[PDB]
Design a protein around this ligand. Sequence first.
Ligand SMILES: Nc1ncnc2c1ncn2[C@@H]1O[C@H](COP(=O)(O)OP(=O)(O)OP(=O)(O)O)[C@@H](O)[C@H]1O
Ligand SMILES: Nc1ncnc2c1ncn2[C@@H]1O[C@H](COP(=O)(O)OP(=O)(O)OP(=O)(O)O)[C@@H](O)[C@H]1O
Ligand SMILES: Nc1ncnc2c1ncn2[C@@H]1O[C@H](COP(=O)(O)OP(=O)(O)OP(=O)(O)O)[C@@H](O)[C@H]1O
Ligand SMILES: Nc1ncnc2c1ncn2[C@@H]1O[C@H](COP(=O)(O)OP(=O)(O)O)[C@@H](O)[C@H]1O
Lengths: 49, 177, 514, 466, 59, 59, 59, 59, 15
Amino acid sequence: MAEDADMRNELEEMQRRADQLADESLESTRRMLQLVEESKDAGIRTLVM
Amino acid sequence: NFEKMGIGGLDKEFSDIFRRAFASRVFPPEIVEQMGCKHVKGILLYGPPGCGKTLLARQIGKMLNAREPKVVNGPEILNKYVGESEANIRKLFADAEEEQRRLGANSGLHIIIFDEIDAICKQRGSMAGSTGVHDTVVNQLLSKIDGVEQLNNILVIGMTNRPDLIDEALLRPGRLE
Amino acid sequence: NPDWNFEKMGIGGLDKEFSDIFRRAFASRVFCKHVKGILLYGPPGCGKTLLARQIGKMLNAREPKVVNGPEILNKYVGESEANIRKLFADAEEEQRRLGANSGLHIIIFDEIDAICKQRGSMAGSTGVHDTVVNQLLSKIDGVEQLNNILVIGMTNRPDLIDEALLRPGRLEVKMEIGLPDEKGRLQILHIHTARMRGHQLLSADVDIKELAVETKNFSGAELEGLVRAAQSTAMNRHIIVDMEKAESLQVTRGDFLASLENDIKPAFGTNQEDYASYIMNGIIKWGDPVTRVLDDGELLVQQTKNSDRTPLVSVLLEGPPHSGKTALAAKIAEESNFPFIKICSPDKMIGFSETAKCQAMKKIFDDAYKSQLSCVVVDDIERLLDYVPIGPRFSNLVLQALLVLLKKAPPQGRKLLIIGTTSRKDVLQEMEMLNAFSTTIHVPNIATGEQLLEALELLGNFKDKERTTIAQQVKGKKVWIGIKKLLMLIEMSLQMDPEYRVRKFLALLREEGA
Amino acid sequence: GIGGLDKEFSDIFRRAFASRVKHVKGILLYGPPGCGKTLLARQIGKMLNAREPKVVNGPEILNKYVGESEANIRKLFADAEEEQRRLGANSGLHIIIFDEIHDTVVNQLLSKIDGVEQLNNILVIGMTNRPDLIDEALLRPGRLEPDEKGRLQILHIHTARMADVDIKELAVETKNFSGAELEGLVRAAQSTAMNRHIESLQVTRGDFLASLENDIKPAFGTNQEDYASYIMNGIIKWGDPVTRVLDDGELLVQQTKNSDRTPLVSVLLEGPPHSGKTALAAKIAEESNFPFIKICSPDKMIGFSETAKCQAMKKIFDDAYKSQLSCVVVDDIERLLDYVPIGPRFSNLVLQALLVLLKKAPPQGRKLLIIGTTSRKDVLQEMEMLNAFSTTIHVPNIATGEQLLEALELLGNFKDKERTTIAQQVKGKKVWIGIKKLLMLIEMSLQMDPEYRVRKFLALLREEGA
Amino acid sequence: IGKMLNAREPKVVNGPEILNKYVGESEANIRKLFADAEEEQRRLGANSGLHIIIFDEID
Amino acid sequence: AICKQRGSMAGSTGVHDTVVNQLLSKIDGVEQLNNILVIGMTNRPDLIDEALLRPGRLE
Amino acid sequence: AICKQRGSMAGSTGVHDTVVNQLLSKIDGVEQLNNILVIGMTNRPDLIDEALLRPGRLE
Amino acid sequence: CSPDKMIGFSETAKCQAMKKIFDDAYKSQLSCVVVDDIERLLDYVPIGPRFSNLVLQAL
Amino acid sequence: ALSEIETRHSEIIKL
Ligand SMILES: Nc1ncnc2c1ncn2[C@@H]1O[C@H](COP(=O)(O)OP(=O)(O)OP(=O)(O)O)[C@@H](O)[C@H]1O
Ligand SMILES: Nc1ncnc2c1ncn2[C@@H]1O[C@H](COP(=O)(O)OP(=O)(O)OP(=O)(O)O)[C@@H](O)[C@H]1O
Ligand SMILES: Nc1ncnc2c1ncn2[C@@H]1O[C@H](COP(=O)(O)OP(=O)(O)OP(=O)(O)O)[C@@H](O)[C@H]1O
Ligand SMILES: Nc1ncnc2c1ncn2[C@@H]1O[C@H](COP(=O)(O)OP(=O)(O)O)[C@@H](O)[C@H]1O
């Protein structure tokens, strides 16, 4: 031999990102954490009143 | 204004270049309308280091043409993802091909400057040390320049210490005279 | 499939090959399995683009798809393979959906070099999808044979791709366009000069017919590029301070001066042959022996030209040093004006392993074997095989890689010759290679003063007064001198003064001739 | 049902089948391409079982192996084990054949054939034209311890599918192509005469016109023959010595055929230079027609290292052994040895190789006649190589003008009239000439003017000292 | 001099730091160095706070 | 095995001599990093490059 | 093959001289382990390095 | 050190085995070394007399 | 599954 090979290689990016907006789905599921608590919080105390 | 400023040497070479590759630019439009002569696509100049080439390669295209030069530094195009390499060159010619489509006869003459081209472009049939096809951005280049779509009103200049390692397939006239 | 008519002149490269592929390619599909694909190579391209654009101009009555390079590729796994099925689905759909077998849909895929490695073994360890040949391969022929559409290819360097994928049935056909022949290139400039010559302004005294032949090995755009520069030069004269002003003048004529100037300086062929370093001053007849040598040399050349019974003629010319040996071989070679002749010389094999020095010589003789005939020159044999008499030592490998090649016959039906030259015959006897040489020539040195004076007259260096001064004493040495040195020492004495030549010249000459 | 190939066929079946009738895992056969591999694989499988299901596997054996194409490579074997595990009472055999043979599949294939679980009672056979490509593990003991009538069938499938070509030319001219790639020109056979810029010209007859090889010549046929070139001019019998030499040589090639205790026979024939003995030996070799002939010529290996040159002679010479019997020639051995007189120097390894060859016997039965050409013997007398040789042969130069005139009469260079002039002296000078230099000289003499042809001929025949 | 004589913190590469398994990112580290002095010159013009680079065992 | 002389000896540029450059650049580099001792052990010491053995890298 | 006997000088250190170093360093190295047994097999007992088989490494 | 065991080595590979054992001998207070059958160790022939000079020089 | 990513967005915004 008396052989040195030092090499590099390249990447294939994974799928599932047609557009970044997809993470806005998380902004949705934030909102259905946002839009859920006050329903019961006023529901049970609406039963109280 | 050129006003014979900044170079300080090699008036011979400057004259030959100017007449060779700016004749198409300088003439009044009718004269070549009788001809079929296109613009030259690009040129290449080399020599030993410290010999004054980057000075001129600034002044040409900095001062001489009404346009903003596009610089590429040598490897800066390169990135690991297989299509981002080429997808960074088309970034360069997109302006000049789309305004070519729009306005055929004349355009703002978007110029690219390669620099230290020997690293980025060498012969396709050498994979030693690379073990990659990615030496073959060049194929995108010369299939882009004249391509199936011929593009006029673009100028490009190469700069190298090493002239001898380039695939001469893109050195043939019309691509680099 | 072919909707419309066309005119062939546009490529102007050759019409034999365009007809040949026209014959083979289109015969099945216009007026057996039909042609699904082609590829083709030329080394500088030399018009690939024009060819593809022009048949695409003709046939489709639509735009075919173009690829710039690898652009199929993308980071997203599989979308790189989505990009190809994008265009193939149209043809596939049309075939089975529409069913008329209308094959106007064809594509130019350029630079197969880049997209495909032969099996993927090239470039060693790569991503599984870093190279996909299998997808588009399977796409075209894999599921079922597709005869409705045509794929085209361009490679300047085919050899990378060639072994794996060009096996028959994917593409059995492969074609190459070579650089122009002399009339080919004639019509190349003709088409380029059509637009100019269609206008009266340009190209007076054009003389294209000698311009072509002035280009030995040139190809394609450089010929075109000569015109680029030739206009640029005539366009230069009027371009004149900061502002370089060209006032409107429609008087401009590309003259041959432009082409002549822009012949040498701006453009360089890939391969060229010159005699300049070998010929400083030509040859001047210094008497009958030079003409004798050329007489029986041309006799020999006609012999090897007409006669098929002895395909080889083993000849050399020997003489003492500095006697005009090498240039003479070059001139006889030119007078043959065979299609292929190469000058072998150790100068170009310098500082090489003797194995490399023979492996450079086997090459050129094979290149010459490829022609129907050729004449090769080998000079300074003794220096090629590095003889030194101090004790004999030389390269033996060179000897025999010279020798047996003298004795062989190239393939039957084509004939050839060799010629060699050296400063000595004696070691050649003892080294037993001149037996192999069939014929021998003695090139003499200058033996006598009278013919010397005659040679001086050809040079015309010395005026008649001093020629007469010479003529008294000069006779009686019966000199052993060779001419190359003659040329040297005349100049050695001229530089003393024009007045005093003699004290230097003659007293310097007496050192020679013992 | 395979013409020829019976001894190899004979031995192979017993050893594998006898055990069936530890059991062998597989048997692998290597044959040259064009051996009718497909029929043999079918024939062997059919013989093994009445109705064992025949399974065919496609050519692309390997794949990426990272979760795709590994299960399928695994699955075909996997199916066989399912029957095997189910039936344990008696022997069960399934035949799987992979025709015309990355990381994981190598390891994976080896594991399936031999495992912790034995997985025996099944066999898989691979047949391939080339040994080296296939995996190393198979070779070690253990896991794997043209046909021109067929080409006529290639015709009567492809050609019969569609004023014609001959019936048989395109079946016996196979040497440059093969029918499995011959599908371009036959399809072009329309295109041949069709391209006349031709609404319809009257329909064709299937017409065959230069559709024979030339439309698409590139092909694989391994012809490996260039015999004729060495003899460019046929040898003319000019003298009794010629018939002597020829008959004395061919008695050797004849007595070898019935010989015992001389399977090799060594002869060296020698003459002075520019006396043709290279075509002559090629002629006598032509004369006795053998299965195999091969020619060791300095021309091919020019400029090669000594260990490459000897290797080349082995490489051809063991092919000659693998033939049942054949003669070979080695020419110009002064050059093969890299000899030069000025100081003695030569290639020694080639010498010693050659010399040991001349007495090395062929393995059991086979025999050869080796000949070699020598300009100069005495060199060989000093190199102590001559004793290994036997029955050496002096081929002389022309001694006499009678033989000369008769020789050029056989040729017919000169008209009898002009031949008179040179005939005027038959003895007047005496000759040392060999045929090659003479034949070279007559051409230049004729090239010169008819006045001076014989005039210059005589001058130059004298220039070499008569 | 770099760190005590003059006012900046110099960016220093120790021998090879640059080199990377992926093409182009090794070289990109070069311009990660220069791009803090590059813009600085861009938006202060000629007058500027000095930037320094120390290579070592550059051979 | 790691570091043998780097002077374009021991084959082509040693055996990946970039490494020893990085190392002796690392220990004596532009930061002092005064707070460590490295042990090293060989049966064939003479091989090692004088650049590393000098006083202050390893005295 | 791998355990051929290395020899010490600046040149001709060897082609495979760097596999053995890790082997022996696993055997008798830092953070000794007593959990192991290892069998060498060969037909060339004289080519093996003498330190590879010294007592404690292969006793 | 005998030729018996060092058969077939090329010249330098003999030299290094010598120098190896002698450098083992320079590590002990008293060393008695043997060289048997010298004339075969440095190969000697009367005919066209030839030998290995570097072996001699080393010795 | 860009169909199901876009639905993972859109249907759940409807939710
Ligand atoms: N001919 C010249 N006239 C005026 N200044 C010059 C000249 N040549 C070099 N210089 C000086 O050097 C600078 C130009 O550098 P130069 O052109 O030599 O780089 P280069 O030749 O491209 O080096 P390399 O070819 O190695 O990239 C100028 O800005 C100036 O400082
Ligand atoms: N036949 C001739 N008559 C007159 N002059 C000649 C002749 N041949 C050559 N010359 C002159 O001699 C010169 C070349 O000599 P040549 O190259 O043959 O020497 P050479 O072959 O190198 O000699 P050697 O091989 O012994 O070194 C040229 O300048 C040329 O003008
Ligand atoms: N009857 C004949 N006797 C001798 N030579 C003949 C005869 N007939 C034809 N030849 C010619 O003699 C030539 C001999 O070439 P060959 O290769 O034998 O050279 P050679 O004599 O072996 O040269 P050398 O013996 O010096 O090596 C052939 O070209 C062949 O045409
Ligand atoms: N008549 C002609 N024949 C051949 N080439 C021509 C002709 N006229 C012009 N050319 C030039 O040849 C070039 C095409 O070369 P091409 O085959 O693309 O080279 P490459 O394969 O190296 O890209 C064009 O740019 C064009 O200017």
